Each structure stands twice: as C-alpha cells, then as structure tokens.
Write an enzyme that holds these catalytic residues in place. Sequence first.
Site, mmCIF file in Angstrom:
data_model
loop_
_atom_site.group_PDB
_atom_site.id
_atom_site.type_symbol
_atom_site.label_atom_id
_atom_site.label_comp_id
_atom_site.label_asym_id
_atom_site.label_seq_id
_atom_site.Cartn_x
_atom_site.Cartn_y
_atom_site.Cartn_z
ATOM 1 N N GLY A 184 0.710 -0.930 -0.072
ATOM 2 C CA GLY A 184 0.223 -0.082 -0.086
ATOM 3 C C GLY A 184 0.928 1.377 -0.473
ATOM 4 O O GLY A 184 1.788 1.359 0.088
ATOM 5 N N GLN A 185 0.129 2.241 -0.292
ATOM 6 C CA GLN A 185 0.421 3.996 -0.854
ATOM 7 C C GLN A 185 -0.546 4.793 0.223
ATOM 8 O O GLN A 185 -0.802 4.830 0.816
ATOM 9 C CB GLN A 185 0.890 4.065 -1.622
ATOM 10 C CG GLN A 185 1.445 5.684 -2.653
ATOM 11 C CD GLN A 185 2.644 5.669 -2.044
ATOM 12 O OE1 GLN A 185 3.303 4.580 -2.500
ATOM 13 N NE2 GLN A 185 3.344 6.624 -1.309
ATOM 14 N N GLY A 186 0.964 6.054 1.530
ATOM 15 C CA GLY A 186 -0.152 6.425 1.944
ATOM 16 C C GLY A 186 -0.044 7.981 2.720
ATOM 17 O O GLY A 186 0.917 8.175 1.499
ATOM 18 N N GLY B 175 4.335 7.618 4.456
ATOM 19 C CA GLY B 175 4.694 6.349 3.668
ATOM 20 C C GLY B 175 4.213 5.890 2.641
ATOM 21 O O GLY B 175 3.205 5.732 2.055
ATOM 22 N N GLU B 176 4.884 4.356 1.867
ATOM 23 C CA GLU B 176 4.762 3.305 1.520
ATOM 24 C C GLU B 176 4.897 2.390 2.546
ATOM 25 O O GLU B 176 5.487 2.261 3.770
ATOM 26 C CB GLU B 176 6.045 2.366 0.090
ATOM 27 C CG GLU B 176 6.676 3.980 -0.219
ATOM 28 C CD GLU B 176 6.741 3.886 -1.512
ATOM 29 O OE1 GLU B 176 8.328 2.733 -1.433
ATOM 30 O OE2 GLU B 176 6.832 3.924 -2.281
ATOM 31 N N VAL B 177 3.812 1.249 2.233
ATOM 32 C CA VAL B 177 3.784 -0.214 3.227
ATOM 33 C C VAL B 177 4.133 -1.339 2.368
ATOM 34 O O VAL B 177 3.782 -1.108 1.176
ATOM 35 C CB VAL B 177 2.743 -0.695 3.956
ATOM 36 C CG1 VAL B 177 2.246 -1.375 4.952
ATOM 37 C CG2 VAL B 177 2.332 0.676 4.663
ATOM 38 N N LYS C 46 7.030 -0.435 6.956
ATOM 39 C CA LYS C 46 6.564 1.046 6.691
ATOM 40 C C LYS C 46 7.198 2.009 6.260
ATOM 41 O O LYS C 46 8.075 2.290 7.526
ATOM 42 C CB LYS C 46 5.080 1.438 8.029
ATOM 43 C CG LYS C 46 5.090 2.894 7.105
ATOM 44 C CD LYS C 46 3.069 2.431 7.798
ATOM 45 C CE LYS C 46 3.354 3.428 9.118
ATOM 46 N NZ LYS C 46 2.608 5.031 8.750
ATOM 47 N N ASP D 156 -4.922 7.510 14.033
ATOM 48 C CA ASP D 156 -5.498 7.869 12.992
ATOM 49 C C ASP D 156 -6.222 6.350 12.647
ATOM 50 O O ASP D 156 -5.726 5.542 11.648
ATOM 51 C CB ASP D 156 -4.421 7.787 12.313
ATOM 52 C CG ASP D 156 -4.574 7.874 10.524
ATOM 53 O OD1 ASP D 156 -5.659 8.238 10.312
ATOM 54 O OD2 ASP D 156 -4.023 7.365 9.710
#
Length: 438
Positions: free
Chosen positions: A193-195, A198-200, A214, A305
């Site tokens: 995933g992307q946030g 950052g990225e995971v 992460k 969050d």
Amino acid sequence: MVTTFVALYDYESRTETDLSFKKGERLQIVNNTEGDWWLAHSLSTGQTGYIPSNYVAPSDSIQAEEWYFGKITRRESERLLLNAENPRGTFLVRESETTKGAYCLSVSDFDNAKGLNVKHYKIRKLDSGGFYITSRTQFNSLQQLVAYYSKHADGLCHRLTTVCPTSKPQTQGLAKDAWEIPRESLRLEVKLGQGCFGEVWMGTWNGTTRVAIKTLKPGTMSPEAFLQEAQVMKKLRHEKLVQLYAVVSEEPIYIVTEYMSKGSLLDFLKGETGKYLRLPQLVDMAAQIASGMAYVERMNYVHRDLRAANILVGENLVCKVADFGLARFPIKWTAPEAALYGRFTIKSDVWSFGILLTELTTKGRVPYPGMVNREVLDQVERGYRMPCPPECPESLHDLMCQCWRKEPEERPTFEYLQAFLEDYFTSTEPQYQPGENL
C-alpha cells in the site's frame, strides 16, 4: 535446579545466537526470570542459544499440554472452536472468566436445530485438590479429566476428539535485544500500500523472517521525536493490537511490524471477502477493535488515526489495530477539536471509532458520501452528522451518535464500547451446561 522446558511449537533460527527447536523438544533453562528471550540448551541436539519464552512450558505442567489455552476468554475460544471444518467434539481447556479459580472445558458440537455451536462445561477445582464437571466423576488432575472424556462422553455432548488447532504465535521482539536494526537487515520485496506519509511493504528481516515494513518520507518527523513515540508503542502488548518489532531510526524511517497477509479491514469489507460478512461478524470485528482500543485507553496512550484502513485482518475474522498515528489527510475520521486545534486524545479516537462503525455497516463506503475534506469540517462543526445507514440497526447508529458528541468529555469510553458490542446480541458470555446425562 535447571528447569526442563518443553517446546509448544516449532521455531526456526533467525540470528547467529538463537536456537532452533521442534515441538516437543525438551530444553534446559537455568534462569527463567520474567523476560522475552531465554538462554536454552537442548539435550536432544546439544545446541544452545536464545529461545522465545512464549514457545515453551515447564515439563509436566498444565501449560505443556496441547489442549490447555490458559487465559483465553469465552469469545476467543468460540472463535477458534467454530472453525467449520473441525469435527464434533473439538475441544480446549481454559480458565473461567465468570468464576475466579475455576477452569472450563470448551467443546464444539452440532445440532439439527442450532447447527454448529460451542458448549462450555465448568471444571470445579475441589478445594482439597481434585477436579470435576460432575461430582459423581472426579479427577486428580485436569489431564486425567481430559484423558477420561476422550474415551467417554458420559454426560458431555460429545466425547473429546480433536485438540483445537491454533496458529503458532508471534515472538516478542525479532531477537534478544533487537530494536534499532540496520537498514541492511531489511529487504523490502512486495508492495502492500501507499499512504500520505509513506509506503507499506512486505519483506524479510535477516533473510529469515517475514515482516511488514512501513516507510516514512524524510521531513515527516525528526528521528528523535519519532524514537520517543516508538518506544511508548513498543511497550504496548495486546492480542488486538499489531506488534511493533523494530525500527530503522535514521532518515528514511522504517517501522517493522507483524505482517498479516489477509490485509486491511477496508479491503476485507469489499468484494469477494466482504460478501460473506453478516451483522454478527461485523459486530464481532467492531468489538475486537474496541478491545484493542480499550487497552490503549487503559495504558493512557492514543492512536490518532483509527479507521478501517488501519485495521488488519487475520484468521477466523481476527481484527488488530495497526499503523498507530505515531507521526500525528484523513479528515473524515478526525474529531473536530483534533483537526481544528490539534487536540488528539483517547476521546478523539472515540470519534474515529464511530466513523469506523459506519464503514463496517456500509461494506466499506467512504464517510460523508459526496463531501470533500473542507466541506466535512465545516458541516461537522455546524453539528452535522451522517444519518443511520440503510441496513444498519438504529441501536448501532445510536452508538455512533454517542461517539460523535461535540464535547470530547461526553463521548463514552472504549471500555463501554467494548462491553456494548460484546453484549449486543446479549453477552459477557454466560452459559454453562448443567450435569444431567449418561
């Protein structure tokens, strides 16, 4: 003396100074003081090293037995026992949460009316040193009770047949004193995933162990304020939270946690996975998340969050709270006083939980359908709240409205939300089979 321990699971070596073993292997351990990694010597292989302490039990103890699950609640014993493939008479023994001191035999059953169900039998601990379910059939130890009911039903619903399958648990930490690890020890291999920070990734530590990693864009946070947050989070330990294993502290910051391949709750509510969730399962997932957050509440800490994208799903519909907002744009989940004034508390998390509840009852639909980030904040500050979703019971929406009170101090606790959702179809789990068969 040196205490002889028995391995409850297999464990593969990860570093140069830990010790491989297989289930049932006996290991000598001199200092078994409370801690996460112990120094062991195998009398089978002659090899030595650190072993994860939750992978062993004292030889000849009730904890060494395959069917003793210890401090598991009635909820979670039913989660494992109701796995639809394991036959009539699948069982485990655990402690009673209704009556202190006493134990409980939990057995899977099946009926033409009720279908697949779990029966719970109270195991009385005779104050002089014996055990029984009925006082006409007494035992010296739990292992003789179980040896017995494995051959004879004798008033039980079914003869005890198969030991309840569980999955080999996490170690606490990756290795003895591994926390701030070098970046070289991590291989980022698969994108999860992307946030907005950052990225995971899915990857490996030391070539050996599956981890999740992460990443955080440089500038997000000075490594010092980060490292202070991460060691508070490292202290947290609960069945319904994802463990933070290790950290790469220099900048670009890595956060190494337990990988859970089923993925986020958000992706799980949707499509092929989410078309088999009914209200009972969705209320069960909410209750687990509330359990995790009730611990965070007890520990006087904050998530910052909470949403379905930050809940990970395991086997048997397990949900774990993940990706703590250590670096704290999900404005649709953010309490007004948190977004407007930076006041993130356990009470702003309660607001977010209310928003997470609408995700759970709408197959994952985005909150405030047709609003943008700016629109939501101004509407919510006016007193607007999402209405009761279609297919959501009015009492779950009433719970959401309590979570969405304007004043943080009028929002309920996570202890209350856990209780409410565990009791929803009526339950702190109180029902024991009486003694009256053959």
